[PDB]
């Protein structure tokens, strides 16, 4: 019996971009979800398939903590059944998703006066991403019928686009650290139970 490292996932100094979102597997620990509420009031705390009031009473098999920084106007796209740029080309949640989407503003940590180009997102791709699919490709995407052959021609663009992330931006453009907890609710085994 020991406390799960949810605090270490939340308080991480350097977060990953949305096209290369990190994944941490939580196992063999006491899933005390009460430590989540120690942070500031979240911008979005929508839960699916479970209730946020009794997470410490249920027991889960696999607990995946997905961490990625997105734009404020794009937080609504991380939800089962949404459609958008981030939902199709960066992070696609399954329709039968079971978990909570936790997002909070991080304009003081992820922004810089001269621009913060460390965070990037995928502007366009060939097809939509499957649920929980990560694509770290950086090859030049061709838009016209003629092959680009890896150069930025008249109709050839880079697949990734960098975020601005300046502190003077609006609330819809400020960075938001999103932690998506994926819960496999006791399918075959019983491994990660809450405090009892």
């Amino acid at each position, epitope marked *: 019996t020991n406390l799960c490292p949810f605090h270490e996932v939340f308080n991480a100094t350097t977060f990953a971009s949305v096209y290369a979102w990190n994944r941490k597997r939580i196992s063999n620990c006491v899933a005390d979800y009460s430590v989540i509420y120690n942070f500031a009031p*979240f911008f979005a705390f929508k839960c699916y398939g479970v209730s946020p009031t009794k997470l410490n009473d249920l027991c889960f098999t696999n607990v995946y903590a997905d961490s990625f920084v997105i734009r404020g106007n794009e937080v609504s796209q991380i939800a089962p059944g949404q459609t958008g740029n981030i939902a199709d080309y960066n992070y696609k949640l399954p329709d039968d998703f079971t978990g909570c989407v936790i997002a*909070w503003n991080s304009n*003081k940590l992820d922004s810089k006066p001269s621009g913060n180009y460390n965070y990037l997102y995928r502007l366009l791709r060939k097809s939509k991403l499957k649920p929980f699919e990560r694509d770290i490709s950086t090859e030049i995407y061709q838009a016209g019928n003629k092959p680009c052959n890896g150069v930025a021609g008249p109709n050839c663009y880079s697949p990734l686009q960098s975020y601005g992330f300046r*502190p003077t*931006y609006g609330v819809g453009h400020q960075p938001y650290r999103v932690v998506v907890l994926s819960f496999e609710l006791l399918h075959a085994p019983a491994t990660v139970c809450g405090p009892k």
Partner: antibody
Amino acid sequence: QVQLQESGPGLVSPSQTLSLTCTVSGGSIRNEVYYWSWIRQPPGKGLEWIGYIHYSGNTYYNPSLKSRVAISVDTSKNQFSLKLNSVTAADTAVYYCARVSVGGRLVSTFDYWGQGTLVTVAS
Amino acid sequence: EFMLTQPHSVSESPEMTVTISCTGSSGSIADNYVQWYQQRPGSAPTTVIYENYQRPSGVPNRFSGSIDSSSNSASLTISGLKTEDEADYYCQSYDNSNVAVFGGGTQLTVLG
């Protein structure tokens, strides 16, 4: 409508902590305007920005007053307070509290201001 | 720092054109929005021009703002000056580090 009103001790002894509470009516400290600032103005001088606070704990203070200015948010009472410790003789000013609009592309629109209160710093 | 500088005082006959200068000592005035507030003697400031070209409801058409990126400065032109417009005007902008900066204030005086 949205109205702001300042409150607190009208006189603070020197070297003490100046504490003023701004009560907002018609709107909570929430997704409404996302910002709540403090502005002071000495008699016969221009305005001076102190700092604004976000409902998610984000604080942005003036570089010349970063060490002394401490702003706290209390969403349960729709009141945000300003704490200015180690007051000096030059801190005599009318402290206003005004909301700032952030829903646009960038921060702007100091739309609604308060009536302000003159807090002297002499014993 | 983004210390804006305004003229200390300006005076002109009524019904004429009056321009208030707002020069940026550093940074860029085009990176952030410029707002103008009118603070009459013994009152709270009121927004006159925001987003550098937008005027809220209730403000007369006599107030209009413009941006001059070639001189990294802004200007507030007044069309048809009258008695009720005699007040203090502060131009406000934002530094790149989320620091809001106000101007020094321009004392308008109706000479007529």
